[PDB]
Design a protein around this ligand. Structure first.
Ligand SMILES: [K+]
Ligand SMILES: [Ru+3]
Length: 263
């Protein structure tokens, strides 16, 4: 079948010139709306949620872990380091690195999370441990954002990512304390107002993580507390044919608007 919402999402996609992937979980009824839900997309920095959550899981058996100093060296800086560059030749804790990675999309911070997990494969191992058989992290930042069409590296499907983000933020993949910390971090994101947020009514609350990369790749994954409604989890992933394509955060906003109007 093609549902009315799917038909609208297809029309949006047709007019964007790229490829759109959407997955909604409505926790009012534990149902799912999917558009290219089983196709792979490059995650770009949306993968930082999985890395931060894996460190939060480690902290369940190490109560001081998030206060653990990590040295930041000049060689650690990469292409986008708004927080970490201030701490070169000093230290940041794993809490600080998690907050920087999630709320500012600091790539040096993400790389410290990855290193704490033993490399990209450690992030994938955490995904598997929480029931996500689809996610894969293969590279550090920034090369995880190359977003080359057809490349399986650093990809997931909308279905899998929605289901993971539910489990992490609303379910029991993390302990109580850790889940609340993750939600606090996502709600404090600085980078999201033009993406899913921009398609929703003002009164709805959002916590999200954006991503972008080559091929005009423009992504957002969110938990949403609508006015008067049980929470939603929404993944919107968008990528384009030309390497140098311009971000399209408006397409994500439009997808979110269609989903909101279809509840
Ligand atoms: K880009
Ligand atoms: Ru159907």
């Amino acid at each position: 079948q093609t549902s009315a919402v799917q038909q609208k999402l297809a029309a949006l996609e047709k007019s964007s010139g790229g490829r759109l992937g959407v997955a909604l979980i409505d926790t009012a009824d534990n149902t799912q709306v999917l558009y290219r839900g089983d196709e792979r997309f490059p995650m770009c920095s949306t993968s930082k949620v999985m890395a931060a959550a894996a460190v939060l899981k480690q902290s369940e058996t190490q109560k001081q872990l998030l206060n653990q100093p990590v040295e930041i060296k000049p060689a650690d800086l990469v292409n986008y380091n708004p927080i970490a560059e201030k701490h070169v030749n000093g230290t940041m804790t794993l809490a600080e690195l998690s907050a920087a990675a999630l709320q500012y999309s600091d790539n040096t911070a993400m790389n410290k999370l990855i290193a704490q997990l033993g490399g990209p494969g450690g992030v994938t191992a955490f995904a598997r441990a929480i029931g996500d058989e689809t996610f894969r992290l293969d590279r550090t930042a920034p090369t995880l954002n190359t977003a080359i069409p057809g490349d399986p590296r650093d990809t997931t499907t909308p279905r899998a990512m929605a289901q993971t983000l539910r489990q992490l933020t609303l379910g029991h993949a993390l302990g109580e304390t850790q889940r609340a910390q993750l939600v606090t971090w996502l709600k404090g994101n600085t980078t999201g107002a033009a993406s899913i947020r921009a398609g929703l009514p003002t009164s709805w609350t959002v916590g999200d993580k954006t991503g972008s990369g080559d091929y005009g790749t423009t992504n957002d994954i969110a938990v949403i507390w609508p006015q008067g409604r049980a929470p939603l989890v929404l993944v919107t992933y968008f990528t384009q044919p030309q390497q140098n394509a311009e971000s399209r955060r408006d397409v994500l906003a439009s997808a979110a608007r269609i989903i909101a109007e279809g509840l």
